Structure formats: C-alpha cells, structure tokens
Amino acid sequence: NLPARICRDIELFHFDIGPFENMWPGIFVYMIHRSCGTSCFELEKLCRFIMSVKKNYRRVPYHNWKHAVTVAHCMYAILQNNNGLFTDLERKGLLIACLCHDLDHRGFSNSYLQKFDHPLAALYSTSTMEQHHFSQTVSILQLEGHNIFSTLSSSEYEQVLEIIRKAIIATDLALYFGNRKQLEEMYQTGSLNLHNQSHRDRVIGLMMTACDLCSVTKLWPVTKLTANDIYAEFWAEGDEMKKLGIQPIPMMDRDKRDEVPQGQLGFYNAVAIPCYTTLTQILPPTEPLLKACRDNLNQWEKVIR
Numbered sequence: 001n002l003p004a005r006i007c008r009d010i011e012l013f014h015f016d017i018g019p020f021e022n023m024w025p026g027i028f029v030y031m032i033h034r035s036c037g038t039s040c041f042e043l044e045k046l047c048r049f050i051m052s053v054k055k056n057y058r059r060v061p062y063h064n065w066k067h068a069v070t071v072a073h074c075m076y077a078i079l080q081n082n083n084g085l086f087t088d089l090e091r092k093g094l095l096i097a098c099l100c101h102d103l104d105h106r107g108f109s110n111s112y113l114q115k116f117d118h119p120l121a122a123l124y125s126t127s128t129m130e131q132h133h134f135s136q137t138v139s140i141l142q143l144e145g146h147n148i149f150s151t152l153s154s155s156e157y158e159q160v161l162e163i164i165r166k167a168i169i170a171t172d173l174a175l176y177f178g179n180r181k182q183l184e185e186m187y188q189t190g191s192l193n194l195h196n197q198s199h200r201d202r203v204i205g206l207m208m209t210a211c212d213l214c215s216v217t218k219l220w221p222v223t224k225l226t227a228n229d230i231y232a233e234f235w236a237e238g239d240e241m242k243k244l245g246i247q248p249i250p251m252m253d254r255d256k257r258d259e260v261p262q263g264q265l266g267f268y269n270a271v272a273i274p275c276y277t278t279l280t281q282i283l284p285p286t287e288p289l290l291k292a293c294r295d296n297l298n299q300w301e302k303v304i305r
C-alpha cells in the first residue's frame with residue numbers, strides 16, 4: 001500500500017515518481033484503481049501484465065520504464081481533474097496505452113531507423129516505432145494469463161485496443177503539429193464537439209502529446225535533470241548519424257550542446273506552450289500543466305541571460 005506522502009502528492013500534476021522502481025507498479029495499480037475501479041482488472045493478471053511490460057522496456061537513458069509510468073501518471077492527473085468526460089473504457093485504455101506507449105524503444109527516432117534501413121521501417125513506413133510499440137502491446141496481451149481485458153466482450157475488447165492503438169500512434173510527435181492545428185481551428189470557430197468521435201480522437205491524441213511531453217510541466221529541478229536524459233539519447237543518435245556518414249540536425253549534435261538553452265526556447269515556443277495552451281482551452285482543469293510549462297520557459301530564458 002502507498003505511503004501517505006505519495007497518496008497526497010500523486011494528485012499533483014507535477015508529481016515525480018521517485019527513484020524506487022519496485023514502487024512504480026504499485027503506483028500504477030493505485031492509479032488504475034482510482035480512475036477505473038478495483039472491480040475492473042483482476043489483480044494477479046494486471047500485475048503479471050505490468051511486470052512483462054516492464055521487462056520489454058530497455059535500459060536507455062530516457063525512453064525507459066520510468067518514462068512509461070510518468071506519462072501514465074500525467075494521464076491519471078488529467079483524468080482525475082476532468083471527471084465525467086471520459087468513459088470507463090477510455091480511462092482504462094488511456095492509462096494502459098501510456099504504460100505501453102514506448103514498448104521496446106531503443107533510444108533512436110523514426111528518422112534514424114529510416115536512414116539506417118532498419119527492418120522495422122520496411123514493416124511500418126510511417127510512425128515506425130509507434131506501430132511497433134502497439135504491436136508489442138498486443139503481443140504481451142496475447143501471452144498466457146496476460147489478457148487484462150479478458151472479462152470484456154469481444155466488441156469492447158476490439159474497441160479498447162483501437163483506443164490504445166490511436167493513442168500510442170498519436171505519441172508520434174510528427175502527428176501532433178497537424179492535430180494541434182485542426183484542434184485550434186475547431187476551438188476558435190466554436191466547432192469542437194466532444195460527442196463527435198473524430199474530434200474526440202483528436203483531443204485524446206493531444207492529451208497523449210501533453211502526457212508524453214510532461215517533463216516540461218514539472219518543477220524546474222525535475223525538468224532540468226530530465227533534459228540530461230533526453231539529450232543523452234539525442235546525442236547518441238547524432239553519434240550514430242555521423243557513423244552513417246550523415247550530418248545530424250543540431251539537436252542531436254553533441255558539438256552543439258552549448259546551444260541547448262536556445263534549443264529549449266525553440267521547443268517551448270513551437271511545441272510545448274502551444275500544446276498545453278490548446279489543452280487548457282479544451283480542458284480548463286489542466287491549466288497547472290500550462291502554468292508549469294510557462295515557469296520552465298522563464299527558467300530557460302533566465303539560463304540564457
């Protein structure tokens with residue numbers, strides 16, 4: 001059972017999951033039980049599932065088991081603060097999608113895989129890693145005793161896998177730019193309709209970006225240390241690009257590491273702030289994410305001064 005400090009702090013958007021890995025599963029179960037119900041998943045089956053998902057995450061600096069659970073917590077926080085909007089099945093599927101959304105990530109982008117001519121890129125031409133993460137998710141469900149949706153009907157099962165599939169694919173940031181533009185026009189024309197399945201899919205997609213990006217919504221000491229992990233992977237991919245005979249983009253070039261603050265400014269401007277701004281417009285209780293993003297932009301501006 002959860003420590004009293006975590007019972008309180010877990011409800012904050014800026015919660016950090018801590019360095020104790022054996023606690024992360026209990027944190028996720030509590031999150032599922034609080035959002036979905038304890039009558040929802042059989043405990044042993046869900047535990048079996050969680051530990052296999054863990055096992056198929058890699059020892060990479062950033063896109064690891066910790067990140068999975070952190071993205072799921074952000075989703076939990078969004079869902080707790082917007083009671084009545086999402087169905088039980090949506091809530092179940094979104095938390096599970098978040099836990100799985102980076103399954104078997106190698107710390108390299110879709111662009112590197114394409115350039116490498118990895119087998120996976122011939123299989124999945126667009127959103128390569130994300131199609132793979134979802135394939136992995138399915139393969140784990142299909143393991144003996146790992147089907148956490150076994151009490152659902154065939155229909156609900158197909159429905160929740162579809163919810164999971166679109167949410168994982170939406171974690172391909174390449175898709176976020178289009179999705180956010182569609183959403184922003186819907187907002188401003190008064191045309192967003194959460195009873196329209198295609199609009200609903202968009203909002204969920206944006207929630208998935210928001211959760212996936214949530215390092216920028218933590219308090220600054222957390223945000224600042226997390227950027228160490230993010231760049232550790234980007235710089236490794238840049239080393240790999242150099243080895244293919246290809247100049248990496250500056251973000252991945254460790255020789256341009258002094259330009260990190262400027263690069264962070266760019267990201268907050270072009271991606272993070274518009275993301276949380278659009279999210280708060282659709283879901284006003286998500287405002288603390290946007291406030292914390294702005295605070296972090298200011299800190300990056302301070303670093304530059």
Ligand SMILES: COc1cc2cncnc2cc1OCCc1ccc2ccccc2n1
Pocket residue numbers: 173213215216227230250251252256257259260261262263264266267
């Ligand atoms: C919190 O920071 C980031 C989170 C991400 C999350 N997903 C995908 N890309 C992400 C990128 C992020 O920042 C990289 C920003 C960036 C851009 C150009 C750069 C050029 C040179 C040096 C550093 C740079 N940094």
Ligand SMILES: [Mg+2]
Pocket residue numbers: 101102171172
């Ligand atoms: Mg990803």
Ligand SMILES: [Zn+2]
Pocket residue numbers: 063067071101102171212
């Ligand atoms: Zn992720």
